[PDB]
Amino acid sequence: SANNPWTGFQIFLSPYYANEVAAAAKQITDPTLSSKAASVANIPTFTWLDSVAKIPDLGTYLASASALGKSTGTKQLVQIVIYDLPDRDCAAKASNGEFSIANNGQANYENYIDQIVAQIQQFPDVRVVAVIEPDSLANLVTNLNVQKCANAKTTYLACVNYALTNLAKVGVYMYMDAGHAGWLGWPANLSPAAQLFTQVWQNAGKSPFIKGLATNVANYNALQAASPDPITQGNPNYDEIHYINALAPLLQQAGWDATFIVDQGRSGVQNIRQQWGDWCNIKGAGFGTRPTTNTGSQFIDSIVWVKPGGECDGTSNSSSPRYDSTCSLPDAAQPAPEAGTWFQAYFQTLVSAANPPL
């Protein structure tokens, strides 16, 4: 729509990623590559609120952003991911999520949202953009035959609804996670996906703060591929622009003037996967197009970096109880540490293979 949340705003740079990057860059031995690595701390990323323990940091980021804006005469914008559903990651082998449906998951998740809202409420001069619950709704489209997902459906819908409804009250601009071209972009998945997203939008009152959808989060697809990646055979929507061009009109037709954001943080190198479903620490990935509202599409508000490159997707150690065997595949960089922890060699390659170059 006419209101692109990023226009006229300075994005607050994640202090946590900045510290990870600074520690990483000092370990890189080549001076030029080290300088390029250090500059990554100046590229805006999303901060993942993957547990209640992250909420105090959110409060500090909002207050820091408010003061930076006043000091520089700018309006500041903080980028967050809401990522703490009960029975999170229902189609994965295991999950690190602190809440379970069986132990008051709904109420605990609502309290997590309430704590986030209570922070955001205190800093009305800071804009907030939130990606809502990566993987969750996409799993409800294609993975209902996973019994954990089938059993989680009502909780996921109620929790996502609670998040949308209550974050809207503090004016947060929200993009529901919507998988990627190889997940929901298959032509046959577009209508079931559109029907689900539209129902979620309706249940949350069609708030204008529910801007649309986020795609490619934590994935590696091109926004606009020079030629189709071989993993995409059978799907005419072989990149994110094809997916979004196909899905956006279905949402519009339902009355939702929906726009999109697209993760490109690990999309600099294409044609690095054996299978489209391979998602874990894909070897040879490079940093991709840096965040910008110059997206080339009427449907896309911004290219963004949602998943922070260098933070691991999962361990390759089969003895870990958090182990997911996708993290031991051939196209997966190994050995790899636990999910979320820093993967230094992977970061160094992300820097070295960045496209455009850093």
Author numbering: 82 to 439
Q: What did the original publication write about this model?
A:
Cellobiohydrolases (EC 3.2.1.91), which hydrolyze cellulose to cellobiose (a β-1,4-linked d-glucose dimer), are key members of their enzyme cocktails, playing a major role in the hydrolysis of crystalline cellulose. The GH family 6 cellobiohydrolase from the basidiomycete P. chrysosporium (PcCel6A) consists of a catalytic domain (CD) and an N-terminal carbohydrate-binding module (CBM) connected by a linker region; this modular structure is typical of fungal GH family 6 cellobiohydrolases. The final structures included residues 82–439. The catalytic site is located in a tunnel enclosed by a pair of loops (residues 174–178 and 390–425), designated here as the N-terminal and C-terminal loops.
X-ray data sets were collected from a PcCel6A crystal and a pNPG3-soaked crystal to 1.2 and 2.1 Å resolution, respectively. Two major conformations of the loops are known, an ‘open’ conformation that makes the subsites more accessible and a ‘closed’ conformation for arrangement of the catalytic site residues into the catalytically competent configuration. In the cellobiose-bound structure, the loops adopted the closed conformation, in contrast to the open conformation observed in the apo structure. The residues in the loops have consistently high B factors compared with other regions of the protein. As shown in Fig. 4(a), the N- and C-terminal loops of the PcCel6A apo structure were both modelled as double conformations with similar occupancies ranging from 0.46 to 0.54. In §3.2, the loops of PcCel6A remained open in the absence of bound ligand, but occupation of the substrate-binding sites induced conformational change of the loops, resulting in a narrowing of the active-site cleft. In the C-terminal loop region, on the other hand, the r.m.s.d. values between the apo and cellobiose-bound structures were similar to that between the two conformations of the apo structure. Therefore, both loops showed clear flexibility, but their mobility and response to ligand binding were different.
